[PDB]
Amino acid sequence: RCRRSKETEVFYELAHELPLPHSVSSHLDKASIMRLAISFLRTHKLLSSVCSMDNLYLKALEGFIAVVTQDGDMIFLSENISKFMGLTQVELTGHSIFDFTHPCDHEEIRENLTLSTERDFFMRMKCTVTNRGRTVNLKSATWKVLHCTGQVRVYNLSCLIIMCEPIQHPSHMDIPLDSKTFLSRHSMDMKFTYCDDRILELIGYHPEELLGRSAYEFYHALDSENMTKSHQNLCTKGQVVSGQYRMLAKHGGYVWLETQGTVIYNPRNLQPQCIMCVNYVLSEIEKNDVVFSMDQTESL
Amino acid sequence: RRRNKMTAYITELSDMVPTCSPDKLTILRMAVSHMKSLTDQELKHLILEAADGFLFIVSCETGRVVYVSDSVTPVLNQPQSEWFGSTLYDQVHPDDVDKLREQLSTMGSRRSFICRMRCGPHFVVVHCTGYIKAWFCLVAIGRLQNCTDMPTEFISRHNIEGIFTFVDHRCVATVGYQPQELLGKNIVEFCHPEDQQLLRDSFQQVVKLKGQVLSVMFRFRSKTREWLWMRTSSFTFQNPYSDEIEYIICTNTNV
Numbered sequence: 052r053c054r055r056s057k058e059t060e061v062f063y064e065l066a067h068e069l070p071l072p073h074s075v076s077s078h079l080d081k082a083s084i085m086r087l088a089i090s091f092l093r094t095h096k097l098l099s100s101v102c103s104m105d106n107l108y109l110k111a112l113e114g115f116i117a118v119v120t121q122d123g124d125m126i127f128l129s130e131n132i133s134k135f136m137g138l139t140q141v142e143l144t145g146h147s148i149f150d151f152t153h154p155c156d157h158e159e160i161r162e163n164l165t166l167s168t169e170r171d172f173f174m175r176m177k178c179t180v181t182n183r184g185r186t187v188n189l190k191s192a193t194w195k196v197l198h199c200t201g202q203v204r205v206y207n208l209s210c211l212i213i214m215c216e217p218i219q220h221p222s223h224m225d226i227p228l229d230s231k232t233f234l235s236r237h238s239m240d241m242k243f244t245y246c247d248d249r250i251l252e253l254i255g256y257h258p259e260e261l262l263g264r265s266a267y268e269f270y271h272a273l274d275s276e277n278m279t280k281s282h283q284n285l286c287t288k289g290q291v292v293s294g295q296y297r298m299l300a301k302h303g304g305y306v307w308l309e310t311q312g313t314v315i316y317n318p319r320n321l322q323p324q325c326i327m328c329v330n331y332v333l334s335e336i337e338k339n340d341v342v343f344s345m346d347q348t349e350s351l
Numbered sequence: 352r353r354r355n356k357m358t359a360y361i362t363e364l365s366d367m368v369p370t371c372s373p374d375k376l377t378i379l380r381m382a383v384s385h386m387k388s389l390t391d392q393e394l395k396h397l398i399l400e401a402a403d404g405f406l407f408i409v410s411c412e413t414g415r416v417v418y419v420s421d422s423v424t425p426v427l428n429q430p431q432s433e434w435f436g437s438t439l440y441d442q443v444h445p446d447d448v449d450k451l452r453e454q455l456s457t458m459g460s461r462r463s464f465i466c467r468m469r470c471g472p473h474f475v476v477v478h479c480t481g482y483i484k485a486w487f488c489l490v491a492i493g494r495l496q497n498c499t500d501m502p503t504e505f506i507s508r509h510n511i512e513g514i515f516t517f518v519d520h521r522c523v524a525t526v527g528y529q530p531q532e533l534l535g536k537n538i539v540e541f542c543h544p545e546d547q548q549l550l551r552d553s554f555q556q557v558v559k560l561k562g563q564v565l566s567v568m569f570r571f572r573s574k575t576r577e578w579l580w581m582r583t584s585s586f587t588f589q590n591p592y593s594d595e596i597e598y599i600i601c602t603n604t605n606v
């Protein structure tokens with residue numbers, strides 16, 4: 052009978068000995084304590100395999116770190132995951148990635164957990180935080196797109212160590228934007244419907260003349276494999292970050308761009324309205340003496 | 352269901368902690384004792400493994416770094432001394448200094464920007480996330496994440512007629528033409544008449560066979576007015592959303 056009070060006190064001691072804040076550790080479930088201890092020391096095994104000031108690294112991150120296993124077990128998630136996903140570190144650590152991600156991406160996730168070792172993909176994970184900071188419950192969770200970049204490791208058996216960054220919504224941005232970044236609006240086929248005035252001083256295009264033009268005619272063809280995929284991802288997940296591609300400049304040459312496309316929706320009919328692209332110009336005009344398309348040749 | 356998973360969790364913790372690797376309640380006190388025999392420094396290694404990034408704290412005004420993690424050497428092949436004691440304006444592409452001033456301008460506000468940093472002249476694209484912490488400083492992790500035209504072939508884009516709507520620079524080495532000379536003109540204009548029909552047939556097929564790659568050869572008229580034999584492998588590109596035929600993507604290869 053007294054063993055129960057001894058069992059509760061040793062469970063309490065185990066929760067406290069986990070590297071966690073004393074509150075959430077003290078008030079926890081027994082099976083959750085088991086999960087967290089197992090995951091923590093299994094992650095320690097992986098970390099000893101790898102290695103053979105926390106607030107600085109954690110807050111200077113537009114994403115959270117997640118190591119998942121080959122079976123899909125999220126053996127570790129960085130503490131700041133909540134900040135992006137609403138679900139706290141305790142709620143997800145030890146559970147399957149498939150139980151908290153979009154099923155339509157599971158195979159992709161399944162394809163990335165297996166086995167080169169570099170991985171770079173997009174996945175829709177459950178989220179319960181809103182643009183106001185108000186965290187909601189799992190019954191009303193929304194799908195958040197995460198760009199996951201990382202490596203798969205054979206720790207002695209596999210582990211996907213990835214950094215998952217959200218793609219900020221263009222309407223809700225708390226990060227500053229430089230004069231080397233401009234906005235654009237597109238229909239769902241990536242045809243231009245609007246773009247910023249900065250494109251004039253950045254790429255030479257008059258913002259009005261680009262309207263109605265297919266963006267597929269304005270990037271250097273050597274990047275098509277990326278662009279297509281991005282668009283496809285943008286159409287299947289609602290969000291995507293392109294790779295670093297070349298947009299043909301006005302009077303010849305190209306500029307280097309990385310853009311984050313997000314499908315937006317009219318809130319009165321909830322249908323896909325358009326795609327908002329925040330385009331980071333990564334360079335000046337390169338090879339401006341070499342025209343590539345007719346849009347540059349007609350422009351004298 | 353609860354009992355089986357609880358027993359499996361206790362067994363996992365036993366299979367995990369090797370110092371009793373078999374009683375029950377004592378496993379928990381053992382696990383606490385093996386946990387007390389040990390999580391901060393390894394987060395940097397996790398960042399370097401997944402994102403291939405390094406931390407740096409830089410003075411907001413002068414740009415002089417006030418701290419740089421050792422991971423700068425794995426990321427940019429640059430010694431820690433090369434970074435410590437200098438400004439980020441010196442460790443970045445010149446055409447990238449202006450943006451830097453806008454990012455370092457001034458507050459726990461965040462910061463997110465891309466810039467070309469020098470590595471151990473070779474520049475590499477680095478994505479920097481971070482935030483402004485007064486010490487005013489910016490504490491930020493920066494991480495690492497074809498150009499063939501700038502030669503046996505060159506790729507081009509055409510409308511359905513064949514009008515060059517895009518050509519990469521390799522053309523100037525293969526057919527000898529400047530891109531302006533090919534752009535705006537149909538590909539048949541550069542074909543030996545004896546082959547023109549055949550070429551046109553292919554352009555009617557790649558559209559009629561959407562997404563399939565056809566290949567036809569013909570005698571391209573070069574800038575030197577030679578009849579250079581050439582194998583064009585072309586296909587129709589489709590807009591992934593509306594399936595809208597966008598252009599015919601040809602790969603003209605000297606043969």
Ligand SMILES: O=S1(=O)N=C(Nc2ccccc2N2CCCC2)c2c(F)cccc21
Binds near residue numbers: 270
């Ligand atoms: O160079 S562009 O004309 N091509 C663009 N995008 C584009 C074209 C074709 C396929 C996919 C894309 N995407 C890039 C990531 C999101 C979707 C684009 C842009 F999104 C903004 C400004 C200028 C240009």
